[PDB]
């Protein structure tokens, strides 16, 4: 509707930081060499570096003469300035120490949350801005070995249940180097060796190398103790950036990037907009340099009309058409609300009976149990426009008894629904495992935890779940069944909107390189497909093959893309190779492809909690919605380098207000997922989710996927 001024985490840099003369050169590493000489790598392949100092290098090299700051592509200008700021004592090391002067490390259990700042340079107009973004690392104060209780048959479990985000820091080394545990590719089995000789070499390697003094050794042993030969050696690779190193759980500690991911920790890593603003001002005021401004830059944003808030509507059996944003004699009943869909998959026309399962976590008080079972019973009735299983969902014996009991009632059946009520104790893996195991049996499931059950009750009926919550549960289940329970008063100027994502995983006669999720111009999800490919030749996926298989797979599912216009989006920056693949697919099928980067991981932050969007550095930042309940700062979705590809040809475009509106609507298609955090247009979001489901051994019912069933969500 209207404009506004908000503060962002940028601080203008002084032009005077720009170097007098710049030296180019053609050819520790190439990046080190540059950094060592106060310069940067202009060209990775042809090893060309730009230096602000006479290049010192005792090897070969060819001087390519001086160049001026105005001749570098923007990116390089920004990288070069970032590097120069460091020379002035303004780098991630320095300012992170300042941050910790105001936001100190806090420990929770055996874990320590460490605040620090992530810094980059964005060139906006003709100026350069230093982006300072507060982030947190979560390091264990206990060693991996100590964590698993020196039990090997417990260590492997750990590497497995935490495979996705687990990293290991070698606290036994002066450089505190971080590593990534290696796994039996396409498996969750970690690469291990109980070979006592390996464990001895490397354990002895640390000492002879970094602690070769009587006292350095004494501390070492006081600190870590004698080698525990019963421990297996963990094969892993550098986290920076092929090599492969050995780590001893006795000398490493798990480490994680908080943003990349308990409870008391989150209330500490989540910061309100004013807390972030304050902390950067504390840092800035402590910065004794005039090479950068003393205060945060403000920018003019475009607020988003509350009208676009109501383009998604639901309806009942009568003629009530209210948008997604939520006395009468009947309000006394526990009956759920009535949602009359606009479209129901044709698969439901034949299906006979549909088994219903109330799966109750035996560890929930009786009342909570009855509450849940009574709530599910009402949820199912509305579902229609029964077996009760009770087990300790928090033990490998129960989940198995549950699955075992379900498969018993599911043989001969095409579809089943499971309503699970579990404590909050359950790990994500356990929830994921119950849902995946149960889907192997054609059972779609909806989990509801104790939290919602206790704190989301209705003020007029404490024996009934919150009416807001009730509608969202209904939406989630319905969406897992491909039901078009809503209508969108909007039309996309595209034939189809497609979200893809690459995540190579070998599977039973498969080899799947990624996934694609298709939405039609009405904003409905119509097809979800896996992208099967050949065994990777070179160290890089053949996108041409990838995207062709995309076109072919959709045909298999009843959708020809040839001679069609589509908005293809992916989870992240669009790589050159993916572009080629898109040019490839463009010509071969005469497909008009409109694409752009859709970044969710950038450091730019606007210290205001409201729906808005603005232009910064040639990109567009958008906040799809405001945080309504939970504490924290909104994370904008970054859009950039848009382009249209017709007849194998790429033509750079500019992101228009209409473009931003399309992303906005696509982002609000979160399908009643309580706790809105969808920071990606539904197409890319679900694309990402499916790639995961495949990598997690989820059954691929092509029958459901062809109708848009979000069963893996
Ligand atoms: Mn992804």
Cα distance between residue 668 and residue 625, in whole Å: 8
Contact 493, 530 (CB under 8 A): no
Using the Cα atoms of residue 638, residue 641, residue 643 and residue 649 in order, give the sign of their dihedral.
Answer: negative
Cα distance between residue 330 and residue 334, in whole Å: 10
| Cα-to-centroid distance, 689 and ligand 1 (Å) | 7
151 annotated to bind ligand: no
461 annotated to bind ligand: no
DSSP symbol at 636: P
| Cα-to-centroid distance, 572 and ligand 1 (Å) | 8
What phi and psi, each to the nearest 5 degrees, are found at residue 473?
A: -70, -40
Q: Let me know how many helices (H) and strands (E) the chain has, helices first.
A: 19, 33
- Checking DSSP bridges between strand 457-458 and strand 461-465, what pairing results, if any? antiparallel
Cα distance between residue 577 and residue 612, in whole Å: 32
| Cα-to-centroid distance, 566 and ligand 1 (Å) | 20
- Which H/E stretch holds residue 503? strand 496-505
136, β-bridge pairs:
115
CA-closest candidate to residue 473, choices 375, 346, 366 = 375
Tokens 């939290």 belong to residue: 451
Task: Please give the CATH architecture assigned to the domain spanning 142-253.
Answer: Alpha-Beta Complex (3.90)
Name 327's Cβ contacts closer than 8 Å, sequence gap at least 6: none
Residue 412 backbone class (left: φ over 0; alpha: ψ -120 to 50; beta: rest): left
Cα distance between residue 557 and residue 549, in whole Å: 12
Contact 33, 49 (CB under 8 A): yes
What does each C-alpha distance from 567 to 182, 343, 423, 499, 521 come to in angstroms? Answer: 36, 24, 41, 8, 10
Residue 563 backbone class (left: φ over 0; alpha: ψ -120 to 50; beta: rest): left
- Which H/E stretch holds residue 683? helix 682-695
| Cα-to-centroid distance, 72 and ligand 1 (Å) | 32
Cα distance between residue 105 and residue 265, in whole Å: 11
Cα distance between residue 70 and residue 307, in whole Å: 44
DSSP labels, 524-569: -EEEEEEEE-----SSS--HHHHHHHHHHHHHHTT---TT-EEEEE
**Helix, strand, coil percentages in the chain from 3-state DSSP, rounded to 5:** 30, 30, 40
Cα distance between residue 380 and residue 316, in whole Å: 16
DSSP labels, 335-402: -------SB--GGGGT-----EEEEEETTS-HHHHHHHHHHHHHHHHHH---EEEEE-TTSHHHHHHH
Name 241's Cβ contacts closer than 8 Å, sequence gap at least 6: none
User: How many other C-beta atoms are found inside a 10 Å radius of the C-beta of residue 468?
Assistant: 12
| Cα-to-centroid distance, 219 and ligand 1 (Å) | 44
CA-CA-CA-CA dihedral for 421, 422, 427, 429, to nearest 10 = -40
CA-closest candidate to residue 385, choices 478, 313, 473, 522 = 478
User: How many other C-beta atoms are found inside a 10 Å radius of the C-beta of residue 158?
Assistant: 18
| Cα-to-centroid distance, 263 and ligand 1 (Å) | 25
Using the Cα atoms of residue 329, residue 335, residue 338 and residue 339 in order, give the sign of their dihedral.
Answer: positive
Cα distance between residue 582 and residue 566, in whole Å: 11
Cα distance between residue 382 and residue 472, in whole Å: 13
CA angle centred on 68, ends 65 and 72, rounded to 5°: 100
Cα distance between residue 101 and residue 193, in whole Å: 43
Cα distance between residue 162 and residue 159, in whole Å: 5
Q: After which residues is the chain broken (C to N over 2.5 A)?
A: 27, 241, 261, 326, 385
651, β-bridge pairs:
644
Contact 713, 686 (CB under 8 A): yes
What phi and psi, each to the nearest 5 degrees, are found at residue 358?
A: -105, 105
Helix (H, G, I), strand (E, B) or coil at 500: strand
Name 244's Cβ contacts closer than 8 Å, sequence gap at least 6: 182, 235, 236, 237
CA-CA-CA-CA dihedral for 174, 178, 180, 182, to nearest 10 = 0
Contact 699, 440 (CB under 8 A): yes
In the chain, list all ranges with CATH 3.90.70.180: 142-253
Cα distance between residue 568 and residue 644, in whole Å: 10
Q: H helices of 55-117, where?
A: 74-87, 92-102
Q: From the options 3.40.50.10190, 3.40.50.1100, 3.30.420.10, 3.40.50.300, give the CATH code of 490-713.
A: 3.30.420.10
Cα distance between residue 512 and residue 505, in whole Å: 5
Tokens 């092509």 belong to residue: 702
Using the Cα atoms of residue 253, residue 256, residue 262 and residue 264 in order, give the sign of their dihedral.
Answer: positive
In the chain, list all ranges with CATH 3.40.50.2300: 312-489
Rg over alpha carbons for the chain, rounded to the nearest Å, is 28
CA-CA-CA-CA dihedral for 390, 395, 399, 404, to nearest 10 = -90
The 3 state secondary structure assigned to 145-179 is HHHCCCCHHHHHHHHHHCCCCCEEECCCCCCCCEE
Cα distance between residue 579 and residue 378, in whole Å: 49
In the chain, list all ranges with CATH 3.30.420.10: 490-713
Helix (H, G, I), strand (E, B) or coil at 231: coil
163, β-bridge pairs:
none
* C-alpha distance across the termini of the chain, in Å: 34
Look up residue 320 and give its two tokens.
Answer: 């009530």
- CB contact burial 297-325 (16+ within 10 A = b; e otherwise): bebebbbbeeebeebbbbbeeeeeeeebe
Tokens 């170097």 belong to residue: 19
What does each C-alpha distance from 353 to 71, 284, 365, 409, 705 come to in angstroms? Answer: 70, 66, 31, 12, 21
Cα distance between residue 100 and residue 691, in whole Å: 38
CA-CA-CA-CA dihedral for 634, 635, 636, 642, to nearest 10 = -170
Q: How was this structure determined?
A: X-ray
| Cα-to-centroid distance, 649 and ligand 1 (Å) | 26
Helix (H, G, I), strand (E, B) or coil at 42: strand
User: How many other C-beta atoms are found inside a 10 Å radius of the C-beta of residue 426?
Assistant: 21
Question: Is residue 451 classed exposed, middle or buried when 0-12, 13-18 and 19+ CB atoms within 10 A define those classes?
Answer: exposed
Cα distance between residue 147 and residue 166, in whole Å: 14
Name 548's Cβ contacts closer than 8 Å, sequence gap at least 6: 581, 584, 585, 588
Cα distance between residue 40 and residue 42, in whole Å: 6
CA-closest candidate to residue 3, choices 657, 628, 655 = 657
What phi and psi, each to the nearest 5 degrees, are found at residue 243?
A: -135, -80
Cα distance between residue 610 and residue 207, in whole Å: 54
| Cα-to-centroid distance, 596 and ligand 1 (Å) | 15
CA-closest candidate to residue 6, choices 493, 673, 612 = 612
713 annotated to bind ligand: yes
- CB contact burial 53-88 (16+ within 10 A = b; e otherwise): eebeeeeeeeeeeeeebeebeeebbbbbbbbbbbeb
Cα distance between residue 386 and residue 409, in whole Å: 10
Contact 5, 19 (CB under 8 A): no
Contact 162, 188 (CB under 8 A): no
| Cα-to-centroid distance, 89 and ligand 1 (Å) | 36
Q: For domain 312-489, give the fold.
A: Rossmann fold (3.40.50)
Contact 666, 651 (CB under 8 A): no
Look up residue 62 and give its two tokens.
Answer: 């060819």
| Cα-to-centroid distance, 8 and ligand 1 (Å) | 27
DSSP symbol at 16: G
Cα distance between residue 276 and residue 293, in whole Å: 17
Helix (H, G, I), strand (E, B) or coil at 445: strand
Cα distance between residue 26 and residue 382, in whole Å: 70
- Which H/E stretch holds residue 137? strand 128-140
Helix (H, G, I), strand (E, B) or coil at 35: helix
CA-closest candidate to residue 644, choices 636, 632, 656, 653 = 653
Name 587's Cβ contacts closer than 8 Å, sequence gap at least 6: 647, 648
Tokens 């005039």 belong to residue: 290
Cα distance between residue 206 and residue 355, in whole Å: 60
Residues recognised as catalytic: 501, 539, 571, 688
Contact 603, 133 (CB under 8 A): yes
Contact 672, 659 (CB under 8 A): no
| Cα-to-centroid distance, 117 and ligand 1 (Å) | 24
Question: Is residue 380 classed exposed, middle or buried when 0-12, 13-18 and 19+ CB atoms within 10 A define those classes?
Answer: middle
CA-closest candidate to residue 18, choices 72, 91, 98, 89 = 72
Instruction: Report the residue count for the chain.
Output: 713
193 annotated to bind ligand: no
CA angle centred on 111, ends 430 and 100, rounded to 5°: 135
């Amino acid at each position: 509707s209207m404009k506004a001024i908000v503060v962002i985490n940028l601080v203008k840099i002084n032009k005077k930081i720009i170097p007098d003369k710049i030296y180019v050169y053609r050819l520790y590493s190439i990046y080190r060499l540059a950094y060592e000489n106060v310069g940067i790598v202009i060209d990775p392949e042809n090893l060309i570096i730009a230096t602000t100092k006479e290049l010192e290098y005792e090897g070969e090299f060819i001087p390519e003469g001086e160049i001026s700051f105005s001749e570098l592509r923007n990116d390089y200008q920004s990288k070069l300035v970032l590097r120069l700021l460091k020379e002035n004592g303004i780098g991630e090391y320095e300012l992170s120490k300042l941050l910790r002067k105001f936001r100190k490390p806090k420990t929770f259990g055996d874990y320590k949350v460490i605040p620090s700042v992530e810094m980059s340079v964005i060139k906006h107009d003709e100026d350069f801005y230093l982006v300072i973004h507060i982030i947190h690392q979560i390091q264990s104060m206990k060693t991996l070995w100590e964590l698993v209780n020196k039990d090997p048959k417990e260590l492997e479990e750990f590497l497995m249940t935490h495979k996705e985000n687990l990293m290991l820091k070698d606290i036994a080394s002066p450089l505190k180097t971080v590593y990534k545990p290696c796994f039996e590719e396409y498996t969750k089995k970690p690469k291990l060796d109980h070979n006592q000789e390996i464990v001895k070499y490397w354990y002895n390697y640390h000492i002879e190398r970094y602690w070769n003094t009587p006292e350095a050794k004494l501390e070492f042993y006081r600190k870590f103790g004698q080698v525990d030969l019963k421990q297996p050696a963990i094969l892993a690779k550098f986290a920076s950036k092929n090599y492969k190193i050995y780590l001893l759980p006795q000398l490493v500690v798990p480490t994680y990037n908080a943003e990349q991911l308990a409870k008391e920790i989150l209330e500490y890593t989540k910061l309100m907009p004013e807390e972030r603003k304050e902390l950067l001002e504390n840092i800035l005021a402590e910065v004794d340099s005039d090479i950068i401004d003393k205060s945060l830059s403000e920018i003019e944003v475009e607020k988003i009309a509350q009208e676009l808030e109501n383009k998604i509507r639901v309806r009942d059996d009568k003629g009530n058409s209210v948008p997604i944003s939520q006395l009468l004699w009947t309000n006394y009943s526990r009956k759920y609300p009535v949602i009359l869909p606009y479209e129901v998959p044709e698969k439901f026309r034949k299906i006979r009976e549909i088994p219903m399962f109330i799966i109750l976590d035996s560890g929930l008080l009786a009342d909570i149990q009855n509450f849940a079972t009574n709530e599910f019973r009402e949820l199912v009735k509305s579902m229609y426009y029964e077996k009760v299983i009770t087990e300790d969902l928090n033990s490998d014996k129960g989940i198995i008894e549950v699955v075992e009991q379900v498969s018993s009632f599911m043989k001969g059946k095409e579809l089943g629904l499971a309503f699970i009520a579990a404590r909050n104790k359950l790990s994500s893996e356990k929830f994921e495992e119950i849902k995946r195991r149960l889907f192997n049996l054609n059972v779609i499931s909806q989990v509801v935890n104790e939290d919602t059950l206790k704190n989301k009750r209705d003020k007029y009926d404490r024996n009934r779940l919150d009416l807001f919550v009730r509608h969202n549960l209904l939406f989630q289940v319905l969406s897992k069944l491909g039901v078009k329970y809503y209508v969108l008063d909007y039309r996309f100027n595209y034939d189809y909107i497609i979200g893809i994502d690459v995540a190579p995983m070998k599977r039973s006669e498969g080899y799947i390189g990624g996934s694609a999720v298709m939405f039609d111009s009405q904003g409905y999800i119509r097809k979800i497909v896996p992208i099967k490919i050949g065994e990777q030749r070179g160290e890089s996926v053949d996108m041409n093959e990838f995207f062709k298989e995309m076109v072919d797979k959709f045909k298999e599912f009843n959708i020809k893309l040839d001679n069609k216009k589509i908005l293809l989006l992916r989870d992240g920056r669009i790589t050159n190779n993916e572009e080629e693949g898109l040019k490839y697919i463009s010509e071969m099928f005469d497909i008009e492809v409109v694409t752009m980067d859709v970044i969710k991981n950038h450091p730019v932050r606007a210290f205001a909690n409201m729906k808005m969007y603005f232009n910064l550095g040639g990109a567009i930042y958008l906040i799809p919605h405001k945080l309504k309940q939970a504490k924290g700062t909104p994370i904008p979705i970054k859009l950039a380098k848009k382009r249209i590809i017709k007849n194998g040809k790429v033509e750079k475009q500019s992101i228009t207000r209409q473009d931003v509106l399309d992303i906005f609507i696509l982002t609000r298609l979160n399908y009643g997922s309580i706790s809105a955090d969808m920071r990606l247009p539904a197409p890319v979001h679900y694309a990402h989710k499916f790639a995961n489901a495949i990598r997690n051994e989820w059954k691929i019912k092509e029958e459901f996927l062809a109708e848009g069933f979000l069963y893996f969500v």
